[PDB]
Design a binder for this molecule. Structure first.
Ligand SMILES: [Mg+2]
Ligand SMILES: [Mg+2]
Ligand SMILES: [Mg+2]
Ligand SMILES: [Mg+2]
Ligand SMILES: [Mg+2]
Ligand SMILES: [Mg+2]
Ligand SMILES: [Mg+2]
Ligand SMILES: [Mg+2]
Ligand SMILES: [Mg+2]
Ligand SMILES: [Mg+2]
Ligand SMILES: [Mg+2]
Ligand SMILES: [Mg+2]
Ligand SMILES: [Mg+2]
Ligand SMILES: [Mg+2]
Ligand SMILES: [Mg+2]
Ligand SMILES: [Mg+2]
Ligand SMILES: [Mg+2]
Ligand SMILES: [Mg+2]
Ligand SMILES: [Mg+2]
Ligand SMILES: [Mg+2]
Ligand SMILES: [Mg+2]
Ligand SMILES: [Mg+2]
Lengths: 187, 136, 147, 53, 128, 225
RNA sequence: GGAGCGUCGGGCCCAUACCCGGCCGUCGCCGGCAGUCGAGAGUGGACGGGAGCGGCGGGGGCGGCGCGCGCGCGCGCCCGCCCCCGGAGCCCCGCGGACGCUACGCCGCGACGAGUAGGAGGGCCGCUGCGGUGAGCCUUGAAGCCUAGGGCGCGGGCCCGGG
RNA sequence: ACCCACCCGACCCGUCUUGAAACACGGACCAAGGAGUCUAACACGUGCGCGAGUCGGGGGCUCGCACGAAAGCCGCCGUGG
RNA sequence: AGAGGGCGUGAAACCGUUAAGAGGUAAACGGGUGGGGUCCGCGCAGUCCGCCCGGAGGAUUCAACCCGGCGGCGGGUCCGGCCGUGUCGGCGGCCCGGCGGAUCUUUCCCGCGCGGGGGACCGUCCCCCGACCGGCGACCGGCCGCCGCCGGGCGCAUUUCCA
């Protein structure tokens, strides 16, 4: 008899993508290979991200991709995003970029290409740079989802600012006993 | 591609046959009857297939062109080899090795031809061997 | 797809995943939102702060269309018009400034979030913010009230 | 009984509602019937607009 | 002089008797078919000394010889002639079973074809 | 192209074979030295006492540096403070053992697990027999048997420890690099004590097997190793 | 003259505990393999001038960074070569690559494996009906039924023989 | 795998229970039947499509529906959510 | 009629008999052997096959080679032409290229400041040839090399078959 807890012996990370789609799965076959045979950890990070959920690979807006490449020095590079590239209607002038993405929305595609931008697929990125050399690996804001505003220290727990799940906002949906001082108390 | 359409097909094709813990595949120009990527007639730009001759004597090799698949009518190109066993193999060998065509296959293609030339063994001889038929 | 659901995997086991000390009885709490004050209170006042109690003024024959006032931010004002108004402008050389009827596009108020590009406008709208006005003037434009 | 976070929600299934469920298996059959009846009315008002007035 | 398989190793089995179901002996209503007991007290399900055994993955077969018939082959249930020609390139490792439902005319047609290709049949001398 | 490369590859081949020879010779001389070192250590303890004894004097030799610690009772119903220390000595299973350098900290940790272990001061031979018969590396967290020095070197060679012999000298003299050589060794899975024990549950002093038995840990080692 | 009681020896007895080995599963390994040299790896390769038995004349270190299977060499004859795998013949081969590669595949190393309530995963486990699909099976005998017949699977179960 | 013998092991299941072989209940035997369903609402997770949008209803245009009460299309494509 | 008028199939409980075996600790069960039965596989030697080789017998036409024909592959000279990506030149399709636009013009036209259609303009989609480059599985034609098949040649130290 041995004393170990077998409690957290199984690591819960993903191995493959849970999706069954065939084009992504080909990318996975390609980046598994590169991951293992190259020294590049870029390939490993990319590989890891191909297995993740929709939630877990959030969309990267065009404006966010602009400003991250506006940063000093990462000039004449390629931005990479395992998610999708979306438009920003609240940005106007779009520099000529180099981009990798699993998806780019039709607007975002036009705007970039009109600028003299190049768009790449991930099979194309590999041939272009199999060890991820000269890349900017970005990500969309993970904690964008409105979901997260309900997460945390519960509402009605002093110093929480945590959206309650409520049928409809309005004068008479919550905001009585436990928010006003006038009505019982407040947190 | 080859790989893309293998993704579509791997588990669903009419030619496949699971059952009894094995799997197999019945698509034509698959030597080794495997549901493999390697050994699949329909998928690959260049294909080998070693069937027996309809005569009952000999073997047919079945190359695929590259010229134009899209046009299956014209795509495969058959060729009977009805020669002295040892020769038959060598002709297949050269077809495969010295044309640099499907080099991966080739030894499987030889064994198939070999087994086919075994088939055309003698049925009567086998019957004699199994039963002694002596003194009732 | 019953095939996939959990009761298929519970077949054979006695309690059906509801335990055997305590069981699956009918309504052990009370039905629904029963006990909001008594005996379910803690859940109510740690996930629904402010359920209980009145507040504010009644309003008898509310009709929502009276208070209709959809807003738009400067952020994306140029979105209302075709790019070639914003292009034939930063060009032209008359110092023209194209009109943007915001009420046509379905927004009544113009509030002031965001940077407006240095490029004159005439914004026609039912209502404006203070800041939205200011930003518009700073671009070298003119806010315009409409009924 | 409520369990840790969720909309304290009021469904309106306390009356005998299953006595008054109204299915829509008609609707295709309906949609046709209107459409026939429509084409008939056109044909009756011969060169007059199908529209109406 | 029957068809020898390619490799005829020693199959070695961990357990030979069927695991039978608790109290299948006592009652005609209970069938031998294994069932794990889920009873709160249960001699068997709590592994007492002297009781009927519970199947585990412990008893598992060695992967080399799992599904290996005594003869050395694995079955493959052939259904008609066309279905045989699969085994052509195995024959030394898989044999052909013919199905129960196949007719005594075309049972014959299969058997002689398998005899050309040297695929061993596991129920040939039968229908007649 | 061809004959130039071939000779370059043959040259490479040779330069390896030379180096292999060299490192082998180092190993051989390192042992020979350690043979002389242990000899010198043994005699020069006797030397001392005889010289005290010549005078009306005493030679109190050094208190021991290093001790082997065998877990001699099982893994049921064991107090949480004990249990923690037992898994700070890596003594998880029953009849696992470890070398342990002694000091005020370490000794007291053994004091808190006394009726759970048998321990004491191992011989030279004990350190050899344990290392050669049951010497297993921790090599990418896989218990792997020390079949060659290529294993020891690969892991401990950044300390000057390049062979089984070096390892034995680091363990036995409790060198600078003891912590790292001792942790490299996977804890010693020894069999049951042949000829049995005296009594599991009681201390050595009082007839049983537990606790410090100092010299006599070596007898126990032989009947278990 | 213990087969009693107190003190102590040797010796022997056996648990699912410990050790070694087999086999099954699970976990872990930034695990390996989409076809390459390489085992404390501590380089490889142009290419130009100047030359050659020269070399890089550094620690009782006991040694790792440098040395004795060649660097230049045997052949063509001091000068030239030091050549190409469609052929070096291979323990490594960078020219092309499994018997192997259903990449949801295949392979290797370690570790571990009680379980109610409860949870999750996988079931080429099982039932009935639908779209597809098996140039499936079936009066030369389907379903069901029965079987001291033959087997497979850890098991749910399954397949064959005879009736 | 059928029967028999012998050595060792071995109390009857289900269940509520801190505790069941119990002098605790249910159970003579066999067959068939027999219990976590569906709708609605919410939340989180996951898969797919599109993405500052998205959406399909409801309605309409295309057929006697064999398959269709499907399928397709709509400045209704967005009244509206 | 092993379908006989409540009759297709005809399970289990339960009963009758026939056969076999057992029998003082209720039976039944798990593990482990033994004995007997039932069938099943044999063998009237199972010495099991397959390569290659050496010898010994017997028998057909070759292979190796050229020659003629067919088909296939691969290649570069991209040689010649079709083919299409990125770029530049034609402002050439632009009216013989259409849609879209809150871009413009009511110098226009038609219908009643508005609707429809022109006409500018911008965005997008197509012709002409030249140049550079990815020369891309997107194809043809010749030439080359290699492979395979058929038929010609080769009659036997060969190449087959068989024992
Ligand atoms: Mg556990
Ligand atoms: Mg539950
Ligand atoms: Mg219950
Ligand atoms: Mg409860
Ligand atoms: Mg109307
Ligand atoms: Mg209990
Ligand atoms: Mg205890
Ligand atoms: Mg105690
Ligand atoms: Mg377990
Ligand atoms: Mg349970
Ligand atoms: Mg109770
Ligand atoms: Mg009680
Ligand atoms: Mg009980
Ligand atoms: Mg009692
Ligand atoms: Mg009761
Ligand atoms: Mg009763
Ligand atoms: Mg039932
Ligand atoms: Mg969701
Ligand atoms: Mg009848
Ligand atoms: Mg009847
Ligand atoms: Mg009937
Ligand atoms: Mg009798």
């Amino acid at each position: 008899g041995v004393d170990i807890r077998h409690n957290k012996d199984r690591k819960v990370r993903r191995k493959e993508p849970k999706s069954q789609d065939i084009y992504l799965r080909l990318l996975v076959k390609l980046y598994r290979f590169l991951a293992r045979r190259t020294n590049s950890t870029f390939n490993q990070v990319v590989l890891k991200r191909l297995f993740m959920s929709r939630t877990n690979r959030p969309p990267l807006s065009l404006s966010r991709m602009i400003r991250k490449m506006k940063l000093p020095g990462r000039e004449g590079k390629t931005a990479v995003v395992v998610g999708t590239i979306t438009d920003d209607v609240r940005v106007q002038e779009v520099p000529k970029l180099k981009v990798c993405a699993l998806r780019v929305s039709s607007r975002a595609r036009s705007r970039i290409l009109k600028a003299g931008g190049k768009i790449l697929t991930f099979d194309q990125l590999a041939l272009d740079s199999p060890k991820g050399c000269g890349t900017v690996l970005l990500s969309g804001p993970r904690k964008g989802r409105e979901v997260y505003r309900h997460f945390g220290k519960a509402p009605g727990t002093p110093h929480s600012h945590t959206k309650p799940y409520v049928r409809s906002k309005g004068r008479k949906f919550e905001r009585a006993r436990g928010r006003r001082a006038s009505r019982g108390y407040k947190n | 591609s080859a790989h893309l359409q293998w993704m579509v097909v791997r588990n669903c094709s009419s030619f496949l046959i699971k059952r009894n813990k094995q799997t197999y595949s019945t698509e034509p120009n698959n030597l080794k009857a495997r549901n493999s990527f390697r050994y699949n007639g329909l998928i690959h730009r260049k294909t080998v297939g070693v069937e027996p001759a309809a005569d009952g004597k000999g073997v047919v090799v079945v190359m695929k062109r590259r010229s134009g698949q899209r046009k299956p009518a014209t795509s495969y190109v058959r060729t009977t080899i009805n020669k002295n066993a040892r020769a038959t193999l060598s002709s297949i060998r050269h077809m495969i090795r010295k044309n640099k065509y499907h080099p991966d296959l080739r030894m499987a293609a030889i064994r198939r031809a070999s087994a086919i030339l075994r088939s055309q063994k003698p049925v009567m001889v086998k019957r004699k061997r199994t039963r002694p038929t002596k003194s009732s | 797809p019953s095939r996939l659901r959990k009761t298929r995997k519970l077949r054979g086991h006695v309690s059906h995943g509801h335990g055997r000390i305590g069981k699956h009885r009918k309504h052990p709490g009370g039905r629904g939102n029963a006990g909001g004050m008594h005996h379910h209170r803690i859940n109510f006042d740690k996930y629904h702060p402010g359920y209980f109690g009145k507040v504010g003024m009644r309003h008898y024959h509310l009709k929502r269309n009276q208070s209709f006032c959809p807003t738009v931010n400067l952020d994306k004002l140029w979105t209302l018009v075709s790019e070639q108004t914003r292009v034939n402008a930063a060009k032209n050389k008359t110092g023209a400034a194209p009109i943007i009827d915001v009420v046509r596009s379905g927004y009544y108020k113009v509030l002031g979030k965001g940077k407006l590009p240095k490029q004159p406008v005439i914004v026609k709208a039912k209502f404006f913010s203070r800041r939205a006005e200011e930003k518009i003037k700073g671009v070298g434009g003119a806010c315009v009230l409409v009924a | 009984a409520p369990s840790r976070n969720g909309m304290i929600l009021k469904p309106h299934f306390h009356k005998d509602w299953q006595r008054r469920v109204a299915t829509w298996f008609n609707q295709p059959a309906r949609k046709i019937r209107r459409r026939k009846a429509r084409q008939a009315r056109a044909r009756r008002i011969a060169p007059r607009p199908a529209s109406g007035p | 002089a029957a068809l020898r398989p390619l490799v005829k190793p020693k199959i070695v089995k961990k357990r030979t008797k069927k695991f039978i179901r608790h109290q299948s002996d006592r009652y005609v209503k209970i069938k031998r078919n294994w069932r794990k007991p889920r009873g709160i007290d249960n001699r068997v399900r709590r592994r007492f000394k002297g009781q009927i055994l519970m199947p585990n993955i412990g008893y598992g077969s060695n992967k080399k010889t799992k599904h290996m018939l005594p003869s050395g082959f694995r079955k493959f249930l052939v259904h008609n002639v066309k279905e045989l020609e699969v085994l052509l390139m195995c024959n030394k490792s898989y044999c052909a079973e013919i199905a129960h439902n196949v007719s005594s005319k075309n049972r014959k047609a299969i058997v002689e074809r398998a005899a050309q290709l040297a695929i061993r049949v596991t129920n040939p001398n039968a229908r007649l | 192209n061809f004959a130039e490369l071939k000779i370059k590859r043959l040259r490479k081949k040779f330069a390896q074979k030379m180096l292999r020879k060299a490192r082998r010779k180092l190993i051989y001389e390192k042992a020979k030295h350690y043979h002389k070192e242990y000899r010198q250590m043994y005699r020069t303890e006797i030397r001392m006492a005889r010289m005290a004894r010549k005078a009306g004097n005493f030679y109190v030799p050094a208190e021991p540096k290093l001790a082997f610690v065998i877990r001699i009772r099982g893994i049921n119903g064991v107090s949480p403070k004990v249990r923690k220390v037992l898994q700070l000595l890596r003594l998880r299973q029953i009849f696992n053992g470890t070398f342990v350098k002694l000091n005020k900290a370490s000794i007291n940790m053994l004091r808190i697990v006394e009726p759970y272990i048998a321990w004491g001061y191992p011989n030279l031979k004990s350190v050899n027999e344990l290392i050669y018969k049951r010497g297993y590396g921790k090599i990418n967290k896989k218990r792997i048997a020390l079949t060659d020095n290529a294993l020891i070197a690969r892991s401990l060679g950044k300390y000057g420890i390049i062979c089984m012999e070096d390892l034995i000298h680091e363990i036995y003299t409790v060198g600078k690099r003891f912590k790292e050589a001792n942790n490299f060794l996977w804890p010693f899975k020894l069999s049951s004590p042949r000829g049995g024990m005296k009594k599991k549950t009681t201390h050595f002093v009082e007839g049983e097997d537990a606790g410090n038995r100092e010299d006599q840990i070596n007898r126990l080692i032989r009947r278990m190793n």
